[PDB]
């Protein structure tokens, strides 16, 4: 679920509020997405916006009653590492995935205040 | 919570239902104890029970609304170890401590089919 999320970015970037910092920021992060990405953080939450339109696909995901975003799943961060859990099941377990290597692709890719709320008429 | 304990002692027991095998076990396993333990296993449950009681006593513990049975907390269980997540309070991180030292114990001690439902009478 989004909560897992936030707590993944944080894990990985200690300074950050996620949902102030990484939402609405150029053309894909935040909810919705279209355009060519504006740079490589956006092109992270490009990847992890296609990362959960795959997950809905699944055949797994379908049959529960919860979309991504409110699709809790279990995990740990221990010294800034992110581990999903074992105990998730096939659909929380492919979330809690797309959801870690987007934390990643954060922590290792420059921010531009520039491109935060976006003028989404440039996507 | 009682569900991330359950799943914690699955994590080093894969073969277990917890729930099944361990509530109702000598004179600790379950709600409630008194008497001297029956058995290893027993002390295990002991211990974990002083854990709780210790949790309880915790000033950050006796501001939430849950006590250690329904207070939810975060881990991860892969390759059958367990990460207490990084993300808990001070309340819940020791509620994942005394869980995840009791799973381990369960995991390490002979388990005796003779002290299931146990005859409190011999508590
Ligand atoms: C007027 C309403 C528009 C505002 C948007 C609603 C706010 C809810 C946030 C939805 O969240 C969208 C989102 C969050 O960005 C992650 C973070 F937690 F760091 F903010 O998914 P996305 O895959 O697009 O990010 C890559
Ligand atoms: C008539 C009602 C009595 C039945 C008991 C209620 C059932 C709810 C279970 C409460 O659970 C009690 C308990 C669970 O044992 C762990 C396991 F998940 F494996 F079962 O805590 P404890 O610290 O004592 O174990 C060491
Ligand atoms: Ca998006
Ligand atoms: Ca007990």
Same mark, same amino acid.
């Given at each position: @679920? $989004?909560? %897992?999320?936030?707590?993944?970015?944080? #894990?990985?970037? *200690?300074?950050? &509020? *996620?949902? $102030?910092?990484?939402?609405?920021?150029? #053309?894909?992060?935040? $909810?919705?997405?279209?355009?060519? =990405?504006? +740079?490589?953080?956006?092109? #992270?939450? %490009?990847?992890?916006? !296609?990362?959960?339109? %795959? @997950?809905?696909? $699944? +055949?797994?995901?379908?049959?529960?009653?919860?979309? *991504?975003?409110?699709?809790?799943?279990?995990?740990?961060?221990?010294?800034? &590492?992110?581990?999903?859990?074992? &105990? !998730?099941? @096939?659909?929380?377990?492919?979330?809690?995935?797309? +959801?870690?290597?987007? @934390?990643?692709?954060?922590?290792?890719? =420059?921010?531009?205040? &520039?491109?935060?709320?976006? +003028?989404?008429?440039?996507?």
């Amino acid at each position: @679920a $989004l909560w %897992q999320f936030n707590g993944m970015i944080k #894990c990985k970037i *200690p300074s950050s &509020e *996620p949902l $102030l910092d990484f939402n609405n920021y150029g #053309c894909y992060c935040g $909810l919705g997405g279209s355009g060519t =990405p504006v +740079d490589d953080l956006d092109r #992270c939450c %490009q990847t992890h916006d !296609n990362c959960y339109k %795959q @997950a809905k696909k $699944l +055949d797994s995901c379908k049959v529960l009653v919860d979309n *991504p975003y409110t699709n809790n799943y279990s995990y740990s961060c221990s010294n800034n &590492e992110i581990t999903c859990s074992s &105990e !998730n099941n @096939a659909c929380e377990a492919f979330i809690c995935n797309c +959801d870690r290597n987007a @934390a990643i692709c954060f922590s290792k890719v =420059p921010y531009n205040k &520039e491109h935060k709320n976006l +003028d989404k008429k440039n996507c």
